[PDB]
Short mmCIF file of C-alpha atoms and ligand atoms in Angstrom, two decimals:
data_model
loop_
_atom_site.label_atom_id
_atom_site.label_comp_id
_atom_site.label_asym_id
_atom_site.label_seq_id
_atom_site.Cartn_x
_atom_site.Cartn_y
_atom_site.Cartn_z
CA UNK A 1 203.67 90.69 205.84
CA UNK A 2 200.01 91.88 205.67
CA UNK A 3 198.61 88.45 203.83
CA UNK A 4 198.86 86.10 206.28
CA UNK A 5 198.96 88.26 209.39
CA UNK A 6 195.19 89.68 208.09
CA UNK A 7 194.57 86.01 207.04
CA UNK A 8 195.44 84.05 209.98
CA UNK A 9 193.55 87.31 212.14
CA UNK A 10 190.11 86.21 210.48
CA UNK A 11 190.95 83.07 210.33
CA UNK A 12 190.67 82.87 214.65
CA UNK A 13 188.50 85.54 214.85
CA UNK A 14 184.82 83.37 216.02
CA UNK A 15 182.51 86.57 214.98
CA UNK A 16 183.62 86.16 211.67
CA UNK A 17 181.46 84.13 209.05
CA UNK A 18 182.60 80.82 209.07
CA UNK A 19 182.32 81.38 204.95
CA UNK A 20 184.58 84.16 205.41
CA UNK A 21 187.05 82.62 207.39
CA UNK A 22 187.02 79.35 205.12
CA UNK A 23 187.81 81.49 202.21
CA UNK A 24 191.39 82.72 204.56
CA UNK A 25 192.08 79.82 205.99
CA UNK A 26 192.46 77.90 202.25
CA UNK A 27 194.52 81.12 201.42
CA UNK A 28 197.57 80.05 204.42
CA UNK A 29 197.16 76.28 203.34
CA UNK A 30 198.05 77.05 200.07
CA UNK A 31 200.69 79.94 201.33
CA UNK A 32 202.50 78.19 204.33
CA UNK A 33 204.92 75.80 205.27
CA UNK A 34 203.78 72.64 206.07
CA UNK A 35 205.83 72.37 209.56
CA UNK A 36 203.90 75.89 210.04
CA UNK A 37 200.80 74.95 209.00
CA UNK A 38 200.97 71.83 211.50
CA UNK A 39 201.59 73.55 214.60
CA UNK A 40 199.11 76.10 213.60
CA UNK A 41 196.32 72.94 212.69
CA UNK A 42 197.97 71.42 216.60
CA UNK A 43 196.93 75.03 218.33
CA UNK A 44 193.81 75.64 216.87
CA UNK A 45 192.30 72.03 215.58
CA UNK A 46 188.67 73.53 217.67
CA UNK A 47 188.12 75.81 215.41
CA UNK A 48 189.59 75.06 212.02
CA UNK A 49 187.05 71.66 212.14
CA UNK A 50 184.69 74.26 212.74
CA UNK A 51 184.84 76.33 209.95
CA UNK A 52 185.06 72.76 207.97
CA UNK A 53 182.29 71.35 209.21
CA UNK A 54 179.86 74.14 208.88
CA UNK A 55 181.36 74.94 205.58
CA UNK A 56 180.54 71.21 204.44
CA UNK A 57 177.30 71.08 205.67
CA UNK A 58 176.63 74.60 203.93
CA UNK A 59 177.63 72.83 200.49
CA UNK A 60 175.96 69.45 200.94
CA UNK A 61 172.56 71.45 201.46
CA UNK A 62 173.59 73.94 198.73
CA UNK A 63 174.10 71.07 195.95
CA UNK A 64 170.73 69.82 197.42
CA UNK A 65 169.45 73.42 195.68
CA UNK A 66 170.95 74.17 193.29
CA UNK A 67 172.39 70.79 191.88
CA UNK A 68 175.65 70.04 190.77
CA UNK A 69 177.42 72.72 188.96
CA UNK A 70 180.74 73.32 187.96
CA UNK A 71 181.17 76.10 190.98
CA UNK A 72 180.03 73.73 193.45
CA UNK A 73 182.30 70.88 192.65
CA UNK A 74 185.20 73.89 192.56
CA UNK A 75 183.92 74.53 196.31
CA UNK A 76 183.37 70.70 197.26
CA UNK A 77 187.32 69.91 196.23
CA UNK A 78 188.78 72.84 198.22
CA UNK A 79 186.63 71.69 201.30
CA UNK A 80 187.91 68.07 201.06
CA UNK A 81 191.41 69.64 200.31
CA UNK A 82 191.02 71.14 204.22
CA UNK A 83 189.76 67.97 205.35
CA UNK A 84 192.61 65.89 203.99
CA UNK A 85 194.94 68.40 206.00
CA UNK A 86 192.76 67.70 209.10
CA UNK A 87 193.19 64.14 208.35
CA UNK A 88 196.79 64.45 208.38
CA UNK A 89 197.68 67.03 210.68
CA UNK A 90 196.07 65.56 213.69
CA UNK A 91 196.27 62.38 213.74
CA UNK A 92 196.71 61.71 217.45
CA UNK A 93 193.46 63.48 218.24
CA UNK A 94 191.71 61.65 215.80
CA UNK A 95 192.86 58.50 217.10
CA UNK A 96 191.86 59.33 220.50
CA UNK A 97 187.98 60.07 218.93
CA UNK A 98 188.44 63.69 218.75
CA UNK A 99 184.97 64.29 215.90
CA UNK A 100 184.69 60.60 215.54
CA UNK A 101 181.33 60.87 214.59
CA UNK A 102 180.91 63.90 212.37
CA UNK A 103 184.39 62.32 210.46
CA UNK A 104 182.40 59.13 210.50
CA UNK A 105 179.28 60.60 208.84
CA UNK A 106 181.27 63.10 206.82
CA UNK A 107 183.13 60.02 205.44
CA UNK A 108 179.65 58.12 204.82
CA UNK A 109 178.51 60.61 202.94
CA UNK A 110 181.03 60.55 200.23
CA UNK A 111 181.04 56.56 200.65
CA UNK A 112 177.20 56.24 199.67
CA UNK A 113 176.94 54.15 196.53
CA UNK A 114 174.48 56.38 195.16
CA UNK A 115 177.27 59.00 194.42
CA UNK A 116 179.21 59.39 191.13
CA UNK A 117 182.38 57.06 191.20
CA UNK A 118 184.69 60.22 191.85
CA UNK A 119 183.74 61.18 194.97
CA UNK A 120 183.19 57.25 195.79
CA UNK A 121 186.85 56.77 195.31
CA UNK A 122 187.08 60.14 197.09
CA UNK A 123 185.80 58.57 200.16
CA UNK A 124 187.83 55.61 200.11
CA UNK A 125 190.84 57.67 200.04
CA UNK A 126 189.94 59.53 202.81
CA UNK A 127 188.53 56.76 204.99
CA UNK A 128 191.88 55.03 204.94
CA UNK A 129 193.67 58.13 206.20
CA UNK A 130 191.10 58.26 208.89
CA UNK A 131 191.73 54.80 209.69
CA UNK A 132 195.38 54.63 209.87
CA UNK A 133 195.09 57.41 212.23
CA UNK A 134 192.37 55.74 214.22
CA UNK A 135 194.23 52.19 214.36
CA UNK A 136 193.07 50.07 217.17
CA UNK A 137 191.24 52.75 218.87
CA UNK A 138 188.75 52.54 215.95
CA UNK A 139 184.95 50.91 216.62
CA UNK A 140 183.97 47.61 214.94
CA UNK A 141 181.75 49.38 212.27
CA UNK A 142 185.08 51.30 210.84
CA UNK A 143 186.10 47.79 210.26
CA UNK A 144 183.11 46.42 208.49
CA UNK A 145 183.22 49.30 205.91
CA UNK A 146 186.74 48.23 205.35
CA UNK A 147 185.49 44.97 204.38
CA UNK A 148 182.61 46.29 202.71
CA UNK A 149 184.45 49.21 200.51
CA UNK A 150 184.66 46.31 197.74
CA UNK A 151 181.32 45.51 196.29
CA UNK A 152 180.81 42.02 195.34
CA UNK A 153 183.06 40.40 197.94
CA UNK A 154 181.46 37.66 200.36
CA UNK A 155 178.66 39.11 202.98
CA UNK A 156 180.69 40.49 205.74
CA UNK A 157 179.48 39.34 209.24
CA UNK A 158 179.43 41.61 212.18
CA UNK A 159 178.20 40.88 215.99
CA UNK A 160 174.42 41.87 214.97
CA UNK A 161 174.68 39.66 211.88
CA UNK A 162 175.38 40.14 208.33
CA UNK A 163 175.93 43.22 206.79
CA UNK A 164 177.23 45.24 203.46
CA UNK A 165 178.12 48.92 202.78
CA UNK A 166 174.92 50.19 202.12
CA UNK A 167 173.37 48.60 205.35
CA UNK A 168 176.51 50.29 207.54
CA UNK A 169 175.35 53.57 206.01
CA UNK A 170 171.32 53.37 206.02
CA UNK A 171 170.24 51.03 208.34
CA UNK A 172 159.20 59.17 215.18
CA UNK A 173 158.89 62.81 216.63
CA UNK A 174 163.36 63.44 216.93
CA UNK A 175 165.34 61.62 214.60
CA UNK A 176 169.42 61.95 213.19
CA UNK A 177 170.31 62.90 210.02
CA UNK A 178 170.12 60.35 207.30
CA UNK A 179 173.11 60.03 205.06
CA UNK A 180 172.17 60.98 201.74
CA UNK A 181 174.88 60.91 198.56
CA UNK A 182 176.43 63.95 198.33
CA UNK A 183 176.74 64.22 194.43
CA UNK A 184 174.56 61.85 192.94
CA UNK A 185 175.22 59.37 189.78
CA UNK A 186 173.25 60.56 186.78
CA UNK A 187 172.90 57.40 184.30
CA UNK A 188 183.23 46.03 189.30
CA UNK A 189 185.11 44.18 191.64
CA UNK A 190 188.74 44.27 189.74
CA UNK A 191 188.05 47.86 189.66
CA UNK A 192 187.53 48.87 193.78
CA UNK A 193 190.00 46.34 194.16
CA UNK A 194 192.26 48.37 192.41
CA UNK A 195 191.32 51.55 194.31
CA UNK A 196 191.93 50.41 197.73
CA UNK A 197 195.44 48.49 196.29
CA UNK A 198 196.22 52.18 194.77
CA UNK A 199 195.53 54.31 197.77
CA UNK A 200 196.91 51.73 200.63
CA UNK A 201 200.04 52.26 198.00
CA UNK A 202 200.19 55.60 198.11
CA UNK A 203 199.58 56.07 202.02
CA UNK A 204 202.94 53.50 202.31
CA UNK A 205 205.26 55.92 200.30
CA UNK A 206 203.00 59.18 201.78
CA UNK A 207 205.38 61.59 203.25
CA UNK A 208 205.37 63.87 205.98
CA UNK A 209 204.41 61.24 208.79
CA UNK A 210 203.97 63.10 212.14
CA UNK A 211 207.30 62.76 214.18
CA UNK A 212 205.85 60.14 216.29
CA UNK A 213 205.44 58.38 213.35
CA UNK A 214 202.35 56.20 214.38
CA UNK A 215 201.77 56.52 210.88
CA UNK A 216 203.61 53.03 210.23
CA UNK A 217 201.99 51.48 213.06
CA UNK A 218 198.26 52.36 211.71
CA UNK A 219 199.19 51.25 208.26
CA UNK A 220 199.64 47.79 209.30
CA UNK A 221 197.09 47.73 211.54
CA UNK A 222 195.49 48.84 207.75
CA UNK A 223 196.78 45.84 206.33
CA UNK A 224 196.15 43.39 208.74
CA UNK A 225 192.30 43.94 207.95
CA UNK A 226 193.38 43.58 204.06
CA UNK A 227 194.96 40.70 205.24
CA UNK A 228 191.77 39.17 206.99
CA UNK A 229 189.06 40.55 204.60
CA UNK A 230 190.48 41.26 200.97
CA UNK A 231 194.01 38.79 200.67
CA UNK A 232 192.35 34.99 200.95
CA UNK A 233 189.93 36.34 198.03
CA UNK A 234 193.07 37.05 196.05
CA UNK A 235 195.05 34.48 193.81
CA UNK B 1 171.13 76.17 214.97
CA UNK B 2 174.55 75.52 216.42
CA UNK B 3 174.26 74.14 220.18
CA UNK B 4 176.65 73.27 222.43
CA UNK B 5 176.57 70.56 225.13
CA UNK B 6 178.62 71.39 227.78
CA UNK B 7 178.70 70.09 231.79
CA UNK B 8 180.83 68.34 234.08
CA UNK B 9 182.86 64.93 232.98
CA UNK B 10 180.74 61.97 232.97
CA UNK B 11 177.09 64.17 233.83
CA UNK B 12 175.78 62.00 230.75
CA UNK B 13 176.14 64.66 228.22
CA UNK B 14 177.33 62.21 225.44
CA UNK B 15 174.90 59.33 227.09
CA UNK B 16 171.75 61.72 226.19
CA UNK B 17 172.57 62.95 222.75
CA UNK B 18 173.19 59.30 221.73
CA UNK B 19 170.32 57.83 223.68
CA UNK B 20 167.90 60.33 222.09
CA UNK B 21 169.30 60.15 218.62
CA UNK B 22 169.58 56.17 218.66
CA UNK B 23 168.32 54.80 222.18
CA UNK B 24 171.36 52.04 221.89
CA UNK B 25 173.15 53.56 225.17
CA UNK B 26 173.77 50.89 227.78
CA UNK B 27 174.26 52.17 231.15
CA UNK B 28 177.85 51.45 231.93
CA UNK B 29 179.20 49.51 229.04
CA UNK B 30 181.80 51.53 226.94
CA UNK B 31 183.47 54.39 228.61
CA UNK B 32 185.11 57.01 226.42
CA UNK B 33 186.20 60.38 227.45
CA UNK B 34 184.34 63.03 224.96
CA UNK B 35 187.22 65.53 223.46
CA UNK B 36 184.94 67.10 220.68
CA UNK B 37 182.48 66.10 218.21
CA UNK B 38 179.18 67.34 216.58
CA UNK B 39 175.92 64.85 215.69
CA UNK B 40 173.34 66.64 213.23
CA UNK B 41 169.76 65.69 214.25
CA UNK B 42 166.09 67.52 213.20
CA UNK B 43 163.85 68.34 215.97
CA UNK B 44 160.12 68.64 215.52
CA UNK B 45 159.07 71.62 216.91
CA UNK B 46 155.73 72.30 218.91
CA UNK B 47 154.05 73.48 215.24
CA UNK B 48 155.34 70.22 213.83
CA UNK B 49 157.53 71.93 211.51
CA UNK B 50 161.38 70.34 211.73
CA UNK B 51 164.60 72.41 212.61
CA UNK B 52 167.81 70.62 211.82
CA UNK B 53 170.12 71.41 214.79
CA UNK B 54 173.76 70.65 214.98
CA UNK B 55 174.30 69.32 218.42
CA UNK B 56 178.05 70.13 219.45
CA UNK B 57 179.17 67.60 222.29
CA UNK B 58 182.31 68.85 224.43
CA UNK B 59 184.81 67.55 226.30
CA UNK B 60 183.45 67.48 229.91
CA UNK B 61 184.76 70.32 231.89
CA UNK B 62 186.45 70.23 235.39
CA UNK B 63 188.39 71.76 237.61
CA UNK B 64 191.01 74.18 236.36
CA UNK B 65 189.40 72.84 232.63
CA UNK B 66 187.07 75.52 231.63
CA UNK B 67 184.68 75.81 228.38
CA UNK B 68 186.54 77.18 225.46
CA UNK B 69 185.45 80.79 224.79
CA UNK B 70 184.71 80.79 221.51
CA UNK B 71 181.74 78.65 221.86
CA UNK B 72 179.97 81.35 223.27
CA UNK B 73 181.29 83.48 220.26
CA UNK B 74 178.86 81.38 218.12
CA UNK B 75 176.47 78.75 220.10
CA UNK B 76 172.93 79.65 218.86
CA UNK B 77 171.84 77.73 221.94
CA UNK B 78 173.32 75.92 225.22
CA UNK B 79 172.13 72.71 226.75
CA UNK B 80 173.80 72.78 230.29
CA UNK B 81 173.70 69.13 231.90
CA UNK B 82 174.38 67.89 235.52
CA UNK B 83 173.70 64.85 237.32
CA UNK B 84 171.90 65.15 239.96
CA UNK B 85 173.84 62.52 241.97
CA UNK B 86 176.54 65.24 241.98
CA UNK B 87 176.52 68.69 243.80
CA UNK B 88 179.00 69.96 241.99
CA UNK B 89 178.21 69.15 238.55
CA UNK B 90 174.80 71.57 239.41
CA UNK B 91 177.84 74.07 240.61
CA UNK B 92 179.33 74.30 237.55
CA UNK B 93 175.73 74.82 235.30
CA UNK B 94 175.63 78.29 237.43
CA UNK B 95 178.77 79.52 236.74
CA UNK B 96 178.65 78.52 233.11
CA UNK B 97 175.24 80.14 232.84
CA UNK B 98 176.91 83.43 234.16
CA UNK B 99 178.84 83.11 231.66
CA UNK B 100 176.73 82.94 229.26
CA UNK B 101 175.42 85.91 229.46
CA UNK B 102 178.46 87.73 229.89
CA UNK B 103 179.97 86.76 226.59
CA UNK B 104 176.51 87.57 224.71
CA UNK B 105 168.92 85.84 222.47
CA UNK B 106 169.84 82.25 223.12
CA UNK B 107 168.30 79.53 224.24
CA UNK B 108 169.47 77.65 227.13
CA UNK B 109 167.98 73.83 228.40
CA UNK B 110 169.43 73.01 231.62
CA UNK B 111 169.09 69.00 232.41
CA UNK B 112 169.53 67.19 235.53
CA UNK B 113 170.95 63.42 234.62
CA UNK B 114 170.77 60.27 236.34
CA UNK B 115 167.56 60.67 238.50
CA UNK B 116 167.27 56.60 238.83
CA UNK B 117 169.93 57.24 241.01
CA UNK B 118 167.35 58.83 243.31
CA UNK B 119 168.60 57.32 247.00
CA UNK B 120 171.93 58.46 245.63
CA UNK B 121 170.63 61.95 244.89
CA UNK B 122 172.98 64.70 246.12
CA UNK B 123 171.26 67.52 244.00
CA UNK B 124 167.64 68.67 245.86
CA UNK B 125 164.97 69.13 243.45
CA UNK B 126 163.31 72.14 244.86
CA UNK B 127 166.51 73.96 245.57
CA UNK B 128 167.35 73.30 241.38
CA UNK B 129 163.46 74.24 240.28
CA UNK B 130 164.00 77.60 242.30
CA UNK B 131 167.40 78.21 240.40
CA UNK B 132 166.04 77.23 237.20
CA UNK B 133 162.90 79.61 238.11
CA UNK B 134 165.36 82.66 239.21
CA UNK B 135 167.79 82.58 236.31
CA UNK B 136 164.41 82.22 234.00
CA UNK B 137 165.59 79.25 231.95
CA UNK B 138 164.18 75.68 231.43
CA UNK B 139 164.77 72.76 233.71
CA UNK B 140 164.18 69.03 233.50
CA UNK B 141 165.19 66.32 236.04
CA UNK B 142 165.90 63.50 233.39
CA UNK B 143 167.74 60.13 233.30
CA UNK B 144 169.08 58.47 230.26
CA UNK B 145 167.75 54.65 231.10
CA UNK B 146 164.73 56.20 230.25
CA UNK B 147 164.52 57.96 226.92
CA UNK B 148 161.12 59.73 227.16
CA UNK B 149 162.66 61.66 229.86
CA UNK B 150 164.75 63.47 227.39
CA UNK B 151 162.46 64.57 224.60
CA UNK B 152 160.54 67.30 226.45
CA UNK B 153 163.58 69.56 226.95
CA UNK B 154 164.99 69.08 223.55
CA UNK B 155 161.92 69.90 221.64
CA UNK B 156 161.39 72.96 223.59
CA UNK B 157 165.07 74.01 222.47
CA UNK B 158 163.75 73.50 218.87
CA UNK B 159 161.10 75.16 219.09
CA UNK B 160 163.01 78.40 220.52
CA UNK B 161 165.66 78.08 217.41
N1 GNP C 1 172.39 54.94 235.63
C1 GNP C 1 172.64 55.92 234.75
N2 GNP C 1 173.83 56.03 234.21
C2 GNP C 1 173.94 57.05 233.35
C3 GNP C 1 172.95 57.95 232.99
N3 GNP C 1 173.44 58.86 232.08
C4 GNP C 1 174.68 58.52 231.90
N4 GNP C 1 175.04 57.42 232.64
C5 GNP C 1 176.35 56.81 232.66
O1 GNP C 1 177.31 57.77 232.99
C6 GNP C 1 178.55 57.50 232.33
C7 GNP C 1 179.05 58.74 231.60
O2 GNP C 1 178.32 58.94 230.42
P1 GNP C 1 178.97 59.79 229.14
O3 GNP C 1 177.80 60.03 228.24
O4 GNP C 1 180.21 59.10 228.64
O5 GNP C 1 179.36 61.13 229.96
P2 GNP C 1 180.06 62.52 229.30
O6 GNP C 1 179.55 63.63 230.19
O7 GNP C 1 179.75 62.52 227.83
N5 GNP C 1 181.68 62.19 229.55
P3 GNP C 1 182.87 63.53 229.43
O8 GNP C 1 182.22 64.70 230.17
O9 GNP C 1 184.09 62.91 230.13
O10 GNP C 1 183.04 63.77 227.93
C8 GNP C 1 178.31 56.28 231.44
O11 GNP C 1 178.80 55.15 232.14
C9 GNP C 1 176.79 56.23 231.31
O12 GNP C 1 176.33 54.93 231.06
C10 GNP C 1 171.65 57.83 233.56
O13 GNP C 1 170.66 58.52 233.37
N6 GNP C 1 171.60 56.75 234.45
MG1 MG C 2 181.16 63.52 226.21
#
């Protein structure tokens, strides 16, 4: 009984390094029950995007040092592993905004073309969870990377005026942080096609839908912007 | 340098991290309810060095809703907000700063919101400069229609991290 009692201890403990308490918290995803593990993500969501976020930002600024190395990538799949689980596990918080903007930029991050084509199709696969959580309640800009996930396609138009993926990510003294790839390339269209076709597939037959079950009603709120955006395009 | 943003519901606490990160706030205009989130910005300190800060916004707090206490288990810094248009919302940066230094150096920016609203004012400014001067911290009257009233404090909270 000691593993996941000592676990889940330094897991909620705040002095704790939020390193240290990544490394236990992966241990009871791996270890527990997925009913358990989503009342545990419903009582403590504060803190477990906590030790994800930090974590995440610790990595994106480590593989700005050191580079890309096998470890990192080791490190940079277990972190997305926790923030799939965030993605699914509270979905009603996320739809009301709860981290709407570090999801956002976390998201945007992994979206930048600049990256290798992994993680790109990493990003889309997580952006659509976010979105079918968000639904409605999402901002016009989650929309316009929808249309804009598929290079190539007609110039989207938003309220400002045109726009395309790269300008939704990058448009003196104080300024934000600018989204930078997190694993660059090192030296098209029927293939991103393909990947939003594959994952908006997979999120249909994707089990373990929260009770309420909202999970149908984002998903064709999903495809009703396939419908506007992607399907005339298509034979 | 983890800080967290923390006042009374609708101070402007969400209002001045966006307006000093993008300056695209319209007064009024969308009205969401903050729950949690975090915006990363880098701060020019007074040498002109840069310190990237991780600005945690919180759900605004109210009566019989109280900060969570494990912020002050790891906030490197606190930027306490009221409006100055509401007596209360001063109240509550008190008895939050008590807190803070209950539950555990730190650096704490107090801000007083919504100072256009002057004929509306309900907060005194020398009764908030002589509470700012007793408990020793760091207190601007600023508004968010006006942007340049919010760099001052947040540079000086860079500068301390
Ligand atoms: N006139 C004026 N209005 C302001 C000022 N600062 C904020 N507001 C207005 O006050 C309202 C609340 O702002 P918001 O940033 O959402 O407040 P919050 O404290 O983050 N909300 P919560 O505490 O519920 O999460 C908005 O309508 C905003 O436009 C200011 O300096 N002047
Ligand atoms: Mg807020």
């Amino acid at each position: 009984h000691g593993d996941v009692k000592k676990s889940t201890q330094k897991v909620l403990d705040p002095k704790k390094d939020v390193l240290t308490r990544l490394k236990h918290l992966r241990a009871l995803l791996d270890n527990v029950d997925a009913n358990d593990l989503k009342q545990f993500f419903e009582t403590n969501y504060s803190q477990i995007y906590f030790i994800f976020y930090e974590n995440f930002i610790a990595l994106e600024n480590s593989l700005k040092l050191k580079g890309n190395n096998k470890s990192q990538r080791e490190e940079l799949d277990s972190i997305l592993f926790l923030f799939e689980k965030i993605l699914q596990f509270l979905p009603e918080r996320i739809f009301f905004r709860w981290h709407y903007q570090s999801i956002g930029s976390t998201l945007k991050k992994l979206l930048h073309t600049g990256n290798s084509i992994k993680i790109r199709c990493e990003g889309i696969r997580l952006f659509l969870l976010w979105l079918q959580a968000l639904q409605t309640n999402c901002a016009e800009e989650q929309v316009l990377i929808f249309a804009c996930l598929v290079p190539g396609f007609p110039a989207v138009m938003s309220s400002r005026g045109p726009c395309t993926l790269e300008t939704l990510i990058n448009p003196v003294k104080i300024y934000p942080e600018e989204i930078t790839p997190l694993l660059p390339a090192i030296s098209q269209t029927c293939f991103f096609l393909q990947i939003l076709l594959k994952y908006m597939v997979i999120q249909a037959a994707s089990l373990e839908w929260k009770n309420k079950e909202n999970q149908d009603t984002g998903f064709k709120f999903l495809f009703t912007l396939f419908r506007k955006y992607y399907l005339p395009h298509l034979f | 340098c983890k800080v967290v943003v923390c006042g009374l519901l609708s101070v402007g606490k969400t209002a001045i991290l966006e307006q000093l990160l993008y300056g695209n706030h319209t007064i009024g205009m969308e009205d969401c309810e903050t729950m949690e989130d975090v915006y990363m910005a880098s701060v020019e300190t007074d040498r002109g060095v840069k310190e990237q800060l991780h600005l945690y916004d919180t759900r605004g707090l109210q009566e019989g809703v109280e900060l969570p206490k494990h912020y002050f288990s790891f906030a490197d810094g606190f930027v306490l907000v009221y409006s100055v248009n509401n007596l209360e919302s001063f109240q509550r940066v008190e008895l939050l700063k008590k807190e803070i230094d209950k539950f555990k150096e730190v650096a704490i920016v107090v801000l007083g919101n919504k100072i256009d609203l002057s004929e509306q004012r309900q907060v005194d400014a020398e009764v908030a400069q002589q509470w700012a001067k007793s408990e020793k911290v760091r207190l601007w009257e600023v508004t968010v229609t006006d942007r340049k009233t919010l760099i001052e404090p947040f540079t000086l909270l860079a500068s301390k991290l």
